Amino acid sequence: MAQILPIRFQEHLQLQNLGINPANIGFSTLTMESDKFICIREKVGEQAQVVIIDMNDPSNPIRRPISADSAIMNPASKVIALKAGKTLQIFNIEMKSKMKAHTMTDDVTFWKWISLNTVALVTDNAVYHWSMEGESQPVKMFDRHSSLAGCQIINYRTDAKQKWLLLTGISAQQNRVVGAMQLYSVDRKVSQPIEGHAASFAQFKMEGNAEESTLFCFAVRGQAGGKLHIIEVGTPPTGNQPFPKKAVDVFFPPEAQNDFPVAMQISEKHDVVFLITKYGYIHLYDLETGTCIYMNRISGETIFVTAPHEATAGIIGVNRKGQVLSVCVEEENIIPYITNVLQNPDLALRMAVRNNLAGAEELFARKFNALFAQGNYSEAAKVAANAPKGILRTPDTIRRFQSVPAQPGQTSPLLQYFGILLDQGQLNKYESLELCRPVLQQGRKQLLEKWLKEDKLECSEELGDL
Numbered sequence: 001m002a003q004i005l006p007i008r009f010q011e012h013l014q015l016q017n018l019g020i021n022p023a024n025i026g027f028s029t030l031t032m033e034s035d036k037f038i039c040i041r042e043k044v045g046e047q048a049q050v051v052i053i054d055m056n057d058p059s060n061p062i063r064r065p066i067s068a069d070s071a072i073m074n075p076a077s078k079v080i081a082l083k084a085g086k087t088l089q090i091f092n093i094e095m096k097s098k099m100k101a102h103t104m105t106d107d108v109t110f111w112k113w114i115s116l117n118t119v120a121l122v123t124d125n126a127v128y129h130w131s132m133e134g135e136s137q138p139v140k141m142f143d144r145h146s147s148l149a150g151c152q153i154i155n156y157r158t159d160a161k162q163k164w165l166l167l168t169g170i171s172a173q174q175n176r177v178v179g180a181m182q183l184y185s186v187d188r189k190v191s192q193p194i195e196g197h198a199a200s201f202a203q204f205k206m207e208g209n210a211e212e213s214t215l216f217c218f219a220v221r222g223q224a225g226g227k228l229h230i231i232e233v234g235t236p237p238t239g240n241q242p243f244p245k246k247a248v249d250v251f252f253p254p255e256a257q258n259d260f261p262v263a264m265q266i267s268e269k270h271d272v273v274f275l276i277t278k279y280g281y282i283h284l285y286d287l288e289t290g291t292c293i294y295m296n297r298i299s300g301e302t303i304f305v306t307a308p309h310e311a312t313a314g315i316i317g318v319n320r321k322g323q324v325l326s327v328c329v330e331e332e333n334i335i336p337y338i339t340n341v342l343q344n345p346d347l348a349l350r351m352a353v354r355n356n357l358a359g360a361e362e363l364f365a366r367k368f369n370a371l372f373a374q375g376n377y378s379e380a381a382k383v384a385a386n387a388p389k390g391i392l393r394t395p396d397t398i399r400r401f402q403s404v405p406a407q408p409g410q411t412s413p414l415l416q417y418f419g420i421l422l423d424q425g426q427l428n429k430y431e432s433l434e435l436c437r438p439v440l441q442q443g444r445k446q447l448l449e450k451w452l453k454e455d456k457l458e459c460s461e462e463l464g465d466l
Contacts, residue, residue: 006337007284008312008330009298013058015040015322020051020061025322027304033113034075035307035316038324041071052078052093055316055324064093075113079132083108088121090132100132109144110153120156120165127156127167127184141165145182147193154179159214160203163187164233166216168196177260179220187234196220197278198261201233202287204243204271207354211237215287217273219250219261226250226261228275228283230290248290250275250283256297263306269313270329270355276303276315282327288354291342298327335359356388368392372400377413385420385431395430402438422456432458436466 015025015038023029024042031039038053042063050071052062069083078094082101088108089101104121111121111130118131121138130138141162144153148169157166166183181196199218205211213236219228228250232243252259256279263276271287280299285292299319306317314328335357338348345363352360364387371380381401384392398417406412411419421427421435435457436448451457 002341004337004341005330006294006334006341007282008314008326008328010309010316010326010328012055012316012324012326013053013322015053015061015318015324018051018053018058018061018322020322022320022322024051025318025320028070030305030318031070031072032305032307032318033072035310036076037073037078038318039071039073039080041066041068050080052080058324062093069108072111072113072119074116074132076116079117081111081113081119081130081132083111088119088130088138090119090130100134100136102130102137104128104138110156112156114156114158114162120158122153122156122167127165129162141186142184142191144169145184145191145193147180148182151178151180157181157183157199157201159186159201159233161214164201164214164216165191166199166201166218168199170197179260181218181220183216185234194218194220195222197226198228198264198275200264200266200273202230202266202268202271202273204268204287205354206241206243206288207350209236209240209243211240213237213240213243215243217264217266217287219264219275219283221250221252221260224249226252226259226277228261228264228273228285228290230273230287246288246290248285248292250277251292251295252277252281256281263303263315263317265306265308265315267308267313267329270331270334270357271351272329272334274315274327276306276317278302280319284329286347286351288351289347291347293337293342299323299325331357333357333359335363339363353388358389361389361391364388364391368397372404372413375407375410375413377401377404377407377416378410381413381416381420385417385424390428393428393431395434398430398434402434422451424456426455427458429458429460429462432460433462433466436463440466 040051048067050066073080079092079099082089086104091098106123109122114120120129126140126143128138128140151169151171155168163186168181170179179197182193184191196218197220202215203212214233230246236242259277259279265274273285275283281297284294301320303317309316309326312328316326335348339345349360349363404413
């Protein structure tokens with residue numbers, strides 16, 4: 001009995017309401033390189049046309065008598081890549097300006113707006129990336145893997161920095177749509193296949209690590225069943241402890257018989273992976289721990305084209321029914337869910353820290369109470385002077401500290417907090433104040449002067465009164 005809702009489902013519109021042919025509501029006849037627009041091709045009578053529907057004002061769909069193989073619009077701009085067999089034309093509808101065009105030697109097995117200006121085009125043998133910058137041409141960043149050879153190329157993925165490029169090829173092999181995904185490392189210049197029904201690369205900074213590690217999430221149903229796996233990509237940044245690669249099973253009810261993952265989205269905003277399976281079933285999993293957060297069918301019709309719901313960091317997509325559907329975390333606060341349903345005040349703490357969300361405030365101060373109590377005045381000091389929203393930068397924190405005298409084996413806790421503060425330069429009113437106040441009486445007022453000049457304090461009129 002899920003007495004609370006951690007997500008929000010949203011149908012944004014209906015293309016049929018927009019007078020769009022449901023037949024022209026089709027992955028072939030529909031294009032969404034981003035939630036920004038909806039590019040739909042539609043032969044109005046004998047007139048082959050393309051409908052452009054900006055989510056901003058779907059009440060006006062931009063319909064154009066375009067007759068191209070297909071039209072993918074720049075994920076943010078009204079420039080659109082228009083295939084004419086091998087003649088792809090990255091052209092702008094905004095100014096109706098033919099931005100750029102090129103004829104490949106081989107018909108584009110698949111091409112998608114991988115950047116705001118690059119299309120990675122796929123040949124039957126290689127994937128070639130075309131920016132609409134200048135006379136830049138489609139550039140083969142890598143080749144098709146024999147693993148995906150002949151497998152229905154659904155989608156191509158790329159690293160956030162495009163240093164790892166994933167291609168998807170599927171095959172209804174032996175009554176089973178073998179969704180295989182080939183990842184190519186740009187920098188290591190090597191490619192690799194995976195069996196994958198949905199995937200995603202995500203840049204997450206592990207708790208306590210210095211930078212984001214590109215996390216490749218990827219879900220797939222196999223003989224082992226539906227299974228999602230979260231792995232860092234490439235070497236971890238120096239000083240970064242590598243992301244522990246994850247592995248989780250995507251469950252499919254008996255009625256989900258032969259359903260398989262089709263759409264994976266992650267809200268880095270929450271570091272949680274939203275996975276949509278074939279039959280319109282959604283699954284929510286922790287980006288970091290693969291923790292199955294939620295799973296349910298949100299549509300009987302497959303949401304054939306989805307998009308990360310940027311407005312909400314969730315996912316947004318269109319079903320068969322032309323309904324622009326979206327799901328996103330009901331982020332009143334995720335911490336209550338983790339604490340109560342997931343029964344994880346600890347994981348609530350962690351997802352908070354990595355996402356800087358309120359609710360673990362209590363739990364934060366608890367962590368503090370521990371570390372301080374555990375003599376970890378170093379760690380507790382760091383998280384104190386650097387508490388998100390100053391939760392442990394309150395004065396009473398500093399007073400706790402001032403109670404704690406010098407302690408061998410460590411810096412005097414007090415001095416630990418204080419070194420942090422001075423190193424933090426200008427500070428808060430409680431910080432600057434409770435800094436000067438003893439040091440005033442401590443007769444080190446000259447050092448206080450220095451911090452004032454050196455702006456290691458607020459230089460506040462409070463201190464002026466002091």
